[PDB]
Amino acid sequence: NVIKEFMRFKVRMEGTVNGHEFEIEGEGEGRPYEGHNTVKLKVTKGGPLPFAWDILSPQFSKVYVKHPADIPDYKKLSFPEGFKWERVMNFEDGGVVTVTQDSSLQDGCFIYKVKFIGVNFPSDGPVMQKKTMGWEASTERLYPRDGVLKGEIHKALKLKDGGHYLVEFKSIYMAKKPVQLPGYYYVDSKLDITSHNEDYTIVEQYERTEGRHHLFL
Amino acid sequence: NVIKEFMRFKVRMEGTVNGHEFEIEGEGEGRPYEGHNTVKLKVTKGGPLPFAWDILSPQFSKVYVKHPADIPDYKKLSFPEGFKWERVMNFEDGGVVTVTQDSSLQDGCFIYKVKFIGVNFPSDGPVMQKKTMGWEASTERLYPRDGVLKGEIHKALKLKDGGHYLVEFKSIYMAKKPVQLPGYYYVDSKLDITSHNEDYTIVEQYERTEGRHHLFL
Amino acid sequence: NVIKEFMRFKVRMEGTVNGHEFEIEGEGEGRPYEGHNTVKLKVTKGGPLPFAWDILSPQFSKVYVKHPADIPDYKKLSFPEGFKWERVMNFEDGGVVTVTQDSSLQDGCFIYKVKFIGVNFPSDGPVMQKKTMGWEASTERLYPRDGVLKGEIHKALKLKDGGHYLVEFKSIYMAKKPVQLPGYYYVDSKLDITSHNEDYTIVEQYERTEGRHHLFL
Amino acid sequence: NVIKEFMRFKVRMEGTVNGHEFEIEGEGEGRPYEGHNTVKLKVTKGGPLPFAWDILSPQFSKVYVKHPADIPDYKKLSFPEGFKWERVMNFEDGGVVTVTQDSSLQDGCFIYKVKFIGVNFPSDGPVMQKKTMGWEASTERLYPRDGVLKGEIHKALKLKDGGHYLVEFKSIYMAKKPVQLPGYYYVDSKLDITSHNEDYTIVEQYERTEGRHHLFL
Numbered sequence: 083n084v085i086k087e088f089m090r091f092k093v094r095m096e097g098t099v100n101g102h103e104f105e106i107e108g109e110g111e112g113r114p115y116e117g118h119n120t121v122k123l124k125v126t127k128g129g130p131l132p133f134a135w136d137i138l139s140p141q142f143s144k145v146y147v148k149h150p151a152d153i154p155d156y157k158k159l160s161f162p163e164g165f166k167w168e169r170v171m172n173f174e175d176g177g178v179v180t181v182t183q184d185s186s187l188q189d190g191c192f193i194y195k196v197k198f199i200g201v202n203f204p205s206d207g208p209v210m211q212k213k214t215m216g217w218e219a220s221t222e223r224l225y226p227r228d229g230v231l232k233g234e235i236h237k238a239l240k241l242k243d244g245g246h247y248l249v250e251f252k253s254i255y256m257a258k259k260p261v262q263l264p265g266y267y268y269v270d271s272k273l274d275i276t277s278h279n280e281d282y283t284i285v286e287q288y289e290r291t292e293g294r295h296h297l298f299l
Numbered sequence: 300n301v302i303k304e305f306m307r308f309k310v311r312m313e314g315t316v317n318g319h320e321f322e323i324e325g326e327g328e329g330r331p332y333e334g335h336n337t338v339k340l341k342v343t344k345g346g347p348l349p350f351a352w353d354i355l356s357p358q359f360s361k362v363y364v365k366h367p368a369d370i371p372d373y374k375k376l377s378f379p380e381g382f383k384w385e386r387v388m389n390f391e392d393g394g395v396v397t398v399t400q401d402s403s404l405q406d407g408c409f410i411y412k413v414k415f416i417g418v419n420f421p422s423d424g425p426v427m428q429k430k431t432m433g434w435e436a437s438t439e440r441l442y443p444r445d446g447v448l449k450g451e452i453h454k455a456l457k458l459k460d461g462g463h464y465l466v467e468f469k470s471i472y473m474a475k476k477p478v479q480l481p482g483y484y485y486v487d488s489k490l491d492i493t494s495h496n497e498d499y500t501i502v503e504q505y506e507r508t509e510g511r512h513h514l515f516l
Numbered sequence: 517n518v519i520k521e522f523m524r525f526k527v528r529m530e531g532t533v534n535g536h537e538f539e540i541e542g543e544g545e546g547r548p549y550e551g552h553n554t555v556k557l558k559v560t561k562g563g564p565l566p567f568a569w570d571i572l573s574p575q576f577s578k579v580y581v582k583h584p585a586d587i588p589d590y591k592k593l594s595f596p597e598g599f600k601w602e603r604v605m606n607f608e609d610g611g612v613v614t615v616t617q618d619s620s621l622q623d624g625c626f627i628y629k630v631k632f633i634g635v636n637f638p639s640d641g642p643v644m645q646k647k648t649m650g651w652e653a654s655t656e657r658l659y660p661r662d663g664v665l666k667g668e669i670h671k672a673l674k675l676k677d678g679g680h681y682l683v684e685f686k687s688i689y690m691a692k693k694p695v696q697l698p699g700y701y702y703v704d705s706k707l708d709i710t711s712h713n714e715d716y717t718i719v720e721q722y723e724r725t726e727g728r729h730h731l732f733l
Numbered sequence: 734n735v736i737k738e739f740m741r742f743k744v745r746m747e748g749t750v751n752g753h754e755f756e757i758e759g760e761g762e763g764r765p766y767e768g769h770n771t772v773k774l775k776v777t778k779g780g781p782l783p784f785a786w787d788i789l790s791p792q793f794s795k796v797y798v799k800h801p802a803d804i805p806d807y808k809k810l811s812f813p814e815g816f817k818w819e820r821v822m823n824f825e826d827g828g829v830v831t832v833t834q835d836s837s838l839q840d841g842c843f844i845y846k847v848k849f850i851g852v853n854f855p856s857d858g859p860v861m862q863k864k865t866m867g868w869e870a871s872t873e874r875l876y877p878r879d880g881v882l883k884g885e886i887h888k889a890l891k892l893k894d895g896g897h898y899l900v901e902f903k904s905i906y907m908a909k910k911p912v913q914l915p916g917y918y919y920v921d922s923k924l925d926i927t928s929h930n931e932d933y934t935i936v937e938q939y940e941r942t943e944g945r946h947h948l949f950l
Contacts, residue, residue, distance in 0.1 A: 098833045098848060101817040101907060166752040168852035170829045176608070178821045178903075180831035180850040182749045197749060199831040199850045201819035202905055205879050218483050219513040221438055223453040225463055228856050234453040234467075236440040238483065246442055246483065250451075250467075252829075254853055256752060266435050266455065266463070272515040290515060296436040298489040298507060315616045315631060318600040318690060383535040385635035387612045391827070395604045395686075397614040397633040399532045414532060416614040416633045418602035419688055422662050445639050469612075471636055473535060652917050653947040655872055657887040659897055670874040670885040672917065680876055680917070684885075684901075700869050700889065700897065706949040724949055730870035732923040732941055 084161055085114055085145070090191050093121065093142055097198035100210065104128030108142060114158065117148030117292040120276070123285040130281035133203070136214045136239050137171070139273055139287060141181055141196055144255065147269055148292040154264040155293075156231050160257035162187045167255050174248040177203040208247045214239040218246070219272040222253075224293075226263040231255040233269065269293045301379045302362070306331055307408050310338065310359055314415035316396075317427065321345025325359060331375065334365030334509040337493070342500040350420070352499040353431045353456050354388070356490055358398055358413050361472065364486055365509040372510075373448050376478035379404045383473045391465040394420035425464045431456040435463070436489035439470075441510075443480040448472040450486065486510050518596045519548050519579070524625045527555065527576050531632030534644065538562030542576060548592065551582025551726040554710070559717045567637065568648045569716045570673055571605070573707055575615055575630050578689065581703060582726040589727075590665050593695035596621045600690045608682040611637035642681045648673040652680070653706035656687075658727075660697040665689040667703065703727050735813045736765055736796070741842050744772065744793055748779075748849035751861065755779025761794065761938075765809065768799030768943040771927070776934045784854070785865045786933040787890050788822075790924055792832055792847050795906065798920060799943040805915040806944075807882050811908035813838045818906050825899040828854035859898045865890040869897070870923040873904075875944075877914040882906040884920065920944045 088111070095106040105127035112119025121142050125131060144167070149155040157165060164186040171179040179200040186193045203209045217239055224233035235251040270292055277286040305328070312323040322344035329336025338359050342348060361384070366372040374382055381403040388396040396417040403410045420426045434456055441450040452468040488508040495502040524545040531538050539561035546553025555576050559565060565572075578601065583589040591599055598620040605613040613634040620627045637643040651673055658667035669685040704726050711720035741762040748755050756778035763770025772793045776782060795818070800806040808816055815837040822830040830851040837844045854860045868890055875884035886902040922942040929936040 101819065101833060101835075168752065170852060174610070178829075178831055180829055180852055182752065182850050182852060184752070197848075197850060199833050199848060201821060201831050201833060202903065219515045221440070221485065221513065223438070223455075225455065227462070236451040236453065238440075238442065245444070252853065268438065270514050272513075296438065296489070297487050298436045318602065318616065318618070385535065387635060393825070395612075395614060397612055397635050399535065399633050399635060401535075414631075414633060416616050416631060418604060418614055418616060419686065469636065653949045655874070655919065655947065657872070657889075659889065661896070668887045670887065672874075672876065679878070702872065704948050706947070730872065730923070731921050732870050 085158055086190070087113060087115060089114055091121075091143065091194060092191060093194040093196065095138070095141065095196040095198060097138070097200070099133050099137070099200040100203050102128060102132055104131060106138070110143065112143070112146045114146045115148060117146060118290050119143050119146040120286065120288045123287070125283040129283040132210070134209045134212045134214045135275070135278070135282045135285060136217060137179065137200065137209055138198070139217065139275065141183070141198060142287065143194070143289070144291070145185065145192065146291065150294065153267055153293055153295070154262040156257060156261055156263055157255060159261040160259060163258040165255055165257045167253060169254070170252040172250045172252070173203070173209070175204055175207050177201070177207065177209060208239065208241060213242045214247060215242055216240055216275060217273055219270070222251070222269040222271065224264070224269060225266045230257070231263055267293055267295055301404060302331055302375055304330060304332060308338070308360060308411060309408060310411035310413065312355070312358060312413040312415060314355070314417070316350050316354070316417035317420050319345060319349055321348055323355070327360065329360070329363045331363045332365060334363065335505070335507050336360055336363040337503065337505045340502045340504070346500050347498045349427065351426045351429045351431045352492070352495070352502060353433065354396065354417065354426060355415070356434070356492065356504055358400070358415060359504060360409070360411065360506070361508070362402065362409065363508065367511065370484055370510055370512070371479040371481040373474060373478055373480055374472060377474035377476060380475040382475055385471045387469040389467040389469070390420070390426070392421055392424050394418070394424065394426060425456065425458060430459050431464060432459050433457055433492060434490055436487065439468070439486040439488065441481070441486060442483045448480055484510060484512055518621060519592055521547055521549060523548055525555070525577060525628060526625060527557070527628035527630065529572070529575065529630040529632060531572070531634070533567050533571070533634035534637050536562060536566055538565060540572070544577065546577070546580045548580045549582060551580065552722070552724045553577050553580040554720065554722050557719045557721070563717050564715045566644065568643045568646050569709070569712070569719060570648045570650060571613065571634060571643055572632070573651070573709065573721055575617070575632060576721065577628070577723070578725070579619065579626060580725065584728060587701055587727050587729070588696045588698040590691060590695055590697055591689060594691035594693060597692040599692055601687060603685060603687040606684045606686070607637070607643070609638055609641050611635070611641065611643055642673070642675055647676045648681060649676055650674055650709060651707055653704070656685070656703040656705070658698070658703060659700045664691070665697055701727060701729055735838060736809055737841070738764055738766060740765055742794060742845060743842060744845035744847065746789070746792060746847035746849055748789070748851070750784050750788070750851040751854050753779060753783055755782055757789070759793065763794070763797045765797045766799060768797060769941055770794055770797040771937065771939045773937045774935070781932045781934060783861065785860045785863050786926070786929070786936060787865045787867060788830065788851065788860060789849070790868070790926065790938055792834070792849060793938065794843075794845065794940070795942070796836065796843065797940070797942065801945060804918055804944055804946070805913040807908060807912060807914055808906060810912035811910060814909040816906055816908040818904060820905070821903040823901040823903070824854065824860070826855050826858050828852070828858070828860060859890070859892060864893045865898060866893050867891055867926055868924055870921070873902070873920045873922065875915070875920060876917045880911065881908070882914055918944060918946055
């Protein structure tokens with residue numbers, strides 16, 4: 083280890099939403115063993131974005147999840163080789179996103195490369211209309227499957243006018259090398275936008291995340 | 300009052316699974332303010348179900364959910380008129396179930412009436428082949444919507460030969476009288492089969508369930 | 517054979533939509549080898565339905581599907597015993613319906629028994645608001661699976677304020693005796709409400725439906 | 734006009750399937766008013782794809798769809814500017830794919846640019862195990878929505894070991910310029926792999942496709 087108490091990271095995203103091409107670059111840092119991390123983003127191409135920043139927020143670091151000792155830390159165990167992760171986001175209004183990412187380690191710094199494709203968002207929807215205002219804190223249900231780690235979440239974006247915009251997440255974590263997998267468990271998360279410029283071409287986020295067993299066990 | 304510290308209930312279910320008709324009846328009791336309840340069932344018609352009992356178990360009492368004082372207990376508030384509940388269960392292998400239920404209070408006893416329709420289960424699947432062995436403890440994400448209370452869960456049935464069989468629950472709770480809805484919150488639950496005969500024509504269940512805010516709030 | 521060129525039928529339905537119970541009875545007739553049939557329904561209980569009649573229309577006769585000689589007529593072959601049918605209807609706005617049906621032959625006439633459960637329809641949506649106006653003609657994709665016949669359709673209801681309300685149908689047909697199944701094929705249908713009273717408590721429908729191979733074959 | 738009776742095209746795709754990156758480039762040609770076209774592809778990077786080629790085939794030209802004079806040919810009318818198209822493919826076993834593409838016209842040659850992300854495919858499934866054998870002919874259901882053209886299809890891949898592997902397609906066609914949209918209609922298609930080398934690093938395809946009204950209209 084390899085994975086120190088303090089770790090920095092670099093991230094780059096190439097994405098497309100309803101046909102709108104964009105690129106984003108950023109840097110972050112956090113305490114992998116404490117379950118917290120922050121990140122600053124900059125839209126390098128296609129800005130300002132014609133859609134809610136919120137749909138991108140969660141694609142910018144699960145190696146920072148705090149895990150109790152009795153729960154194998156698959157993501158952490160994968161380094162230095164690292165792991166890849168994939169995801170599907172099913173929006174209640176038909177919107178669909180598919181994400182592919184690669185997580186590596188270079189000279190003590192984490193390297194994240196992301197590809198994102200979002201389609202079918204209604205022109206007058208909350209995404210396309212920028213009517214959201216952050217995510218609610220969430221709880222992911224994880225389990226080992228097909229030799230890899232999987233998890234699902236029932237998430238929600240807060241609507242300006244009140245109410246919520248529902249999104250189901252389905253993620254897949256795949257170590258680049260064989261690593262001990264955990265059993266059924268949960269991960270609580272809370273992602274906040276801490277700052278941003280008026281057109282959201284510059285953004286700062288904070289995330290707290292921790293794994294645990296269900297409370298009744 | 301109407302809802303005492305100790306309350307009993309009676310339940311009747313009329314269902315069909317893959318064309319197989321059946322009837323179930325039972326009696327239960329519990330501590331509504333403590334978050335626990337038990338129930339004893341008996342298959343009265345269509346006896347010897349040709350499918351896993353597990354898919355029926357969660358259809359047999361949310362008025363028993365322990366809620367903190369700062370979270371409006373919508374279901375409890377609904378009495379004496381009571382409430383209705385509906386649900387969709389999406390099985391990973393294509394099976395689908397819709398449930399509609401009516402909850403009332405009669406002579407100091409909770410009265411539950413359930414209709415269930417399950418279709419599209421593979422004949423060789425874990426349901427039709429009775430390969431399941433109980434649910435993992437779960438956590439439901441609730442929120443108010445359309446004037447009613449809704450909630451979703453990523454649940455899972457343990458496989459006898461190892462692994463899990465996934466199911467997504469979508470529930471709707473509808474008070475028969477206008478009462479206070481809570482905001483976004485969660486419900487942890489754990490249902491166990493405490494006793495049964497080999498063919499599951501006689502079963503007893505126990506369930507613990509409590510409402511709460513997300514752990515990071 | 518038992519299936520004459522002219523055949524009548526009797527249907528009875530017990531359903532629930534968003535907690536509202538209802539019952540319907542009807543009588544119909546048609547020419548099974550020609551691909552057309554009519555039916556007259558009367559709401560016998562729960563009358564003055566508080567939702568779009570159109571969601572019920574398609575649950576009231578596949579044995580009447582015209583099949584070319586080179587495509588095994590599974591449903592017809594199942595008689596005199598008959599067959600069962602189940603279905604899932606997934607509505608674009610979240611509403612979900614499950615149906616289970618039993619088709620038999622008695623007194624020289626077909627006997628239909630249907631059970632319907634509909635949930636999660638938004639209070640302000642086209643179904644509960646009664647804003648639909650008939651289905652567009654459709655095309656079902658069928659194939660043999662798990663020893664039975666299955667088919668799916670991408671359906672659509674026309675709306676009063678223009679546009680369409682999309683629904684995906686997934687049906688399963690199950691013979692009560694082993695009969696020959698066909699391979700991959702298509703069924704074309706067009707259902708029309710031919711008459712109805714002011715409150716839709718008495719309704720008359722017409723349906724044309726025919727099986728065939730893809731046109732490029 | 735801009736669109737002549739015979740037209741060639743250039744296509745290129747960047748994709749990722751279950752974390753495996755690849756690139757493909759190719760050229761095709763056909764008769765846009767006749768609904769016939771062919772294409773030849775070469776895997777340029779990510780050599781020897783570790784998954785079924787079949788999943789990519791339908792991503793390689795709807796301007797070639799034959800339309801009757803009474804049905805607006807939205808895609809054709811969008812030129813010379815062109816149009817973009819997006820798509821979601823939902824695999825029966827959990828795999829999900831999103832696609833985004835751009836179609837333009839350059840000096841008499843159509844230019845196609847495709848981005849593809851596929852995730853959640855079971856390692857032991859027909860895709861990653863290459864057990865598929867081409868698509869069945871299909872029929873897409875189209876309708877105008879949100880100022881654009883949408884269509885859905887219930888498709889199927891033939892399994893080597895027999896049977897079919899089901900896939901639901903959801904496509905969105907967006908003209909770069911708001912040209913005339915058609916109303917509800919269908920498109921029949923039949924895609925065949927005409928030639929291919931052992932490892933699917935060189936492949937040629939043929940597609941027949943024509944738009945039309947429902948047969949009962």
